Structure formats: C-alpha cells, structure tokens
C-alpha cells in the first residue's frame, strides 16, 4: 500500500460521492454475471440463471451492500488494512472457504463499476489509486489463510 498523500485524497474524495448500497449490488451482481464460476458460493440465493435474475435478486443486492459496507470501513483505516480485515480474513478462510482470487476479481469489477458511474471523473491517475486500494484490500482479506 504505497498510497501517496495525493493518491489517498483522491480515493477519499471520490468515495464521498458513492452510494454504497447501489455500488455494492452492482459490483457483486456484475461479478456473478462476468465470472459465473463465482456463483458457487451462492446456491441459496436462488435464481442466478440470467443477468436480470442476478442483478435484481434481492439476496445479491443485500449481500453486495454488506460487502461494500465492510469495504467502506476499510477505506477509513487505509493505514491498517490487515488489522481492519483480520476477523473477516479468518471467516472467509475457515468458514466460508472462499478462494482469495475472488477478492481480486471483485476489485476489478468494482473498478469498472466506478468508471461506469463517474465517467470522465475516473481519470487514469484516480484508477491507479483505486487499483492499489483494491489490491491492498484483497491482500488484507487473504492474510489469515492457511
């Protein structure tokens, strides 16, 4: 996590405009749609057969909001992601058995979601800041795997 002061202000300024509820549902739904293998964790979510069925699924929306919720908090402790994400890292490993590669896929989807939403405001340099952040978070979420 080599976030220069200016990379950090940039992450923070944009994050101010985000509707985490909405972004969370979009990012998770889009993950399940672009990389359908990731659907392996949600067979209790019901119908994920088509894009509309995934995107509109009340369960996907609710889980996305949760995920992005934890992510936003992560954004207030950029200094200590590993600490911030420790119990969550354990849970994904030990209880949910989620391959950490899943965390990188979602980060990329999230980056595309932010670009989708902010248009021209998501400049090359802002993307570069967010690239470091999603990677920092995936790394923190994978730190307790064994």
């Amino acid at each position: 996590m080599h976030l220069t002061p200016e990379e950090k202000s940039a992450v923070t300024a944009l994050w101010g405009k985000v509707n985490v509820d909405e972004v969370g549902g979009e990012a998770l739904g889009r993950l399940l749609v672009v990389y359908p293998w990731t659907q392996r964790f949600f067979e209790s979510f019901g119908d994920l057969s088509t894009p509309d069925a995934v995107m509109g699924n009340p369960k996907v929306k609710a889980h996305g909001k949760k995920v992005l919720g934890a992510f936003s908090d992560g954004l207030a402790h950029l200094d200590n992601l590993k600490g911030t994400f420790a119990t969550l890292s354990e849970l994904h490993c030990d209880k949910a058995h989620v391959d950490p590669e899943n965390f990188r896929l979602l980060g990329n989807v999230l980056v595309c979601v932010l670009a989708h939403h902010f248009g021209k405001e998501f400049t090359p340099p802002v993307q570069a800041a967010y690239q470091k952040v999603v990677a920092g978070v995936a790394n923190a979420l994978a730190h307790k795997y064994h």
Partner: protein
C-alpha cells in the same frame, strides 16, 4: 467461445465506439501505464508522457486491430494471424500483460459508454478481449 449473443453484444458496443476507437485505445494505454507500471518495460523507446504522440499513434494501431477482429468475429485466428506472429516472434510480450490491457480497455469503454456498458455487454466484451488475447499468444511456444 463467443455465442451469437456475445457477437451481437460486441458488434453493438464496438459499433458505438465508431470514430473514437483511436482515442479510447490511447486512453486504455495510459491507464495501463499508470496502474501497471511494469507494462512500461515493453516501451523503453516511447515517450510515455501525457499526450505523447507515440502513445496516440500506438493507441490507434491497437484500436484498428480490435476493429478488425470485430469485423471478422467468425474468423479471428486468421484475421489476426500476422499480429499473432509479431507478438510471438518479435515483441515476445509476456502473456500476463494481455489481461492488464484488456482490463484497462474495459475501464475505458465503461467510462465512455454508460448506456451500453450493461452487465450482459460487460461479460461479452470481457470474453471477446480474452479471445483476442488468446489468439495473439497462440504461437508463443
């Protein structure tokens, strides 16, 4: 493999790119240079400064090639043969870098086509770029 729907999706999204392909190609490059600095090792001879004409120049060539693969979506291996040869034999770009550019291309399109960049289209465009990458890397060994 690309399904009829995928093909339709791609021709549609790319259709909208139209005349901006060149510029979006340049932009995808700059995004890549900034986010994945390791990709820069392949362009030691380029001026990578913002608004670099070399980058502009190169962005257009990449865009033309993508545009050519869309025009020949049913015969990509043949449409891209020459480019597959160049990459395998001269440039020898490590395969992992294709994924990085692909990614930066998806970000660029998303940032420019809000109405078209739907989940369905996003999925189609991602499979397409993966297929182009596969072709370009097919003759490596």
């Amino acid at each position: 493999v690309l399904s009829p729907a995928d093909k339709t999706n791609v021709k549609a999204a790319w259709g909208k790119v139209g005349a901006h392909a060149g510029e979006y190609g340049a932009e995808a490059l700059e995004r890549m240079f900034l986010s994945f600095p390791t990709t820069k090792t392949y362009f030691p001879h380029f001026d990578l400064s913002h608004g670099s004409a070399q980058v502009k120049g190169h962005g257009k060539k990449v865009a033309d090639a993508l545009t050519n693969a869309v025009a020949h979506v049913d015969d990509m291996p043949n449409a891209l043969s020459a480019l597959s040869d160049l990459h395998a034999h001269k440039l020898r770009v490590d395969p992992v870098n294709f994924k990085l550019l692909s990614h930066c291309l998806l970000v660029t399109l998303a940032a420019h086509l809000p109405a078209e960049f739907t989940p369905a289209v996003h999925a189609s465009l991602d499979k397409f770029l993966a297929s182009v990458s596969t072709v370009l890397t097919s003759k490596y060994r």
